Subunit: 98 residues, 2 copies
């Protein structure tokens, strides 16, 4: 992963001294450079991933709404059908009593 | 902010200067330091936000899975009731036809 804030800071402290040997300076600059390039790339991928997750979420919430409505319909069709025999039995007894 | 890679790079090039004046050296390092601290925080927020969304997705997934199960069970029970109505007619036929 990317440099911890304290490792980044330590590199800046090194660069503070103008008497730092040239090879140490250009090594430190390259370290900052590679780190930042990677960090930015990783951040941009995370942003792309986060956007796609937000679409997934909206879609799942809409599908969930659909199923909830679909479920309610089926439960209604079911409770209607469950009473048909009882409705028949009622009519049978009314007929028998007349 | 956060600095673009090429804006970051330009500060790295300033720090590659022999005769860089102390006050410019100091300002350039503070720019890197301030930028990195900010970037790290932004990145950590986005990481945490992403984790939150990934949990929300997993949950919506399960809730959808549950709805679809209950849907199939209500449809199954509807078919079971229709079968019962058919058996009722069959029993009635057996009694009528005597």
């Amino acid at each position: 992963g990317p440099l911890k804030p304290e490792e980044h800071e330590d590199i800046l402290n090194k660069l503070l001294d103008p008497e730092l040997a040239q090879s140490e300076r250009t090594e430190a600059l390259q370290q900052l450079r590679v780190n930042y390039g990677s960090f930015v790339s990783e951040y941009n991928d995370l942003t792309k991933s986060h956007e796609k997750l937000e679409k997934v979420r909206k879609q799942l919430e809409a599908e969930k709404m659909e199923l909830q409505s679909a479920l309610e319909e089926a439960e209604a069709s079911l409770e209607h059908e469950e009473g048909k025999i009882l409705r028949a039995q009622l009519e049978f007894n009314q007929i028998k009593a007349e």
